[PDB]
A paper describes a structure:
α-Helical coiled coils are ubiquitous protein domains, found in a wide range of structural and functional contexts. The structure of coiled coils is understood at a level unrivaled by any other fold. The seven positions in a heptad are labeled a – g, where positions a and d are oriented towards the core of the bundle and are thus mostly hydrophobic. We find that they indeed break the α-helices to form short β-strands, which associate into a triangular supersecondary structure we name the β-layer. β-Layers are found, also repetitively, in natural coiled coils, where they form regular fibers with alternating α- and β-structure, a protein fold that has not been described so far.
From Thermosinus Tcar0761 we derived the constructs T9, with the full MATKDDIAN motif, and T6, with the shortened motif MATKDD. In contrast, the T6 structure shows a ‘real’ 6-residue element. Here, the β-layer is formed by the first three residues of the insert, MAT. The last three residues of the insert assume geometrically clear e, f and g positions and the C-terminal GCN4 adaptor follows in its native register, starting with an a position. Therefore, the β-layer occurs again in place of position d. A conflict with the native register of the N-terminal adaptor is avoided with just a small ‘twist’ to the adaptor’s last residue: The C-terminal leucine, natively occurring in position g, is rotated outward from the core of the bundle by about 15° so that its Crick angle is biased towards the angle of a c position. In Figure 3 this is noted as a g/c position, as it is close enough to an ideal position g for the preceding coiled coil to stay in register and close enough to a position c for the formation of the subsequent β-layer (highlighted in pink in Figure 3D).
Residue numbers in the entry:
A (entry chain A): -1 to 65
B (entry chain C), C (entry chain B): 0 to 63
C-alpha cells in the first residue's frame, strides 16, 4: 500500500546516500589541492626567469664563439 | 513503526547535510584538471627550451 | 503525521538528486594526488636540468 511505497522510496534513498558517502570519501582521499598547485606554480615562476636568463647567456656565448 | 521510519528519514537527512558541507569543502580546496594542464603545458614548454639549450651548450663545448 | 513524513522524504529525495549531480561534476573536474605527483616530478626534472645548465654555462664562460 501507501506505507509500503514510502518504505520502498526510503530504501532507494538509503542506498543512494550510502553510495554518495562512498564517493565523497573517495574524492577527499584522492583530491590534489589548490595549495599543492600554488606551491608548484611558485617554483615554476622561479624557473621561468632562470630559463630566460640562460637563453640570454647562451646567446652571448654563441656570438662570442662566433668571432 | 511510523516512528522508526521517521527516525530513518531524519538519520538520512543528517547524513545528507554533512555530505553537502563536505562537497562545499571539496570545491573550495580542489585543484582542477584545466589548471593542472595549464601548468603542465608551461613546464613542458620550459623543458623543451632547456633541451635546446643543452644541445647548444654541447655544440659550443665541442667548438672550444 | 503521514504528511509530516512525506514532506521530509521529499526534502531527502530532492537533496540526494542534487548531490548526485554535483558529485558527478566534481569527479570530472578534480585533479588527483597522482596527477600532482607526476607534475611534481616533471618540475624536479626541470629544476635539476636548469641547475646543471647554469653550471655548464658558468664553466664555458670561464673557458672563453
Ligand atoms: Ca621524483
Ligand atoms: Cl630550484
Amino acid at each position: 500500500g501507501h506505507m509500503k511505497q514510502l518504505e520502498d522510496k526510503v530504501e532507494e534513498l538509503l542506498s543512494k546516500v550510502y553510495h554518495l558517502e562512498n564517493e565523497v570519501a573517495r574524492l577527499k582521499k584522492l583530491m590534489a589541492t589548490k595549495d599543492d598547485m600554488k606551491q608548484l606554480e611558485d617554483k615554476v615562476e622561479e624557473l621561468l626567469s632562470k630559463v630566460y636568463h640562460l637563453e640570454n647567456e647562451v646567446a652571448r656565448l654563441k656570438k662570442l664563439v662566433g668571432e
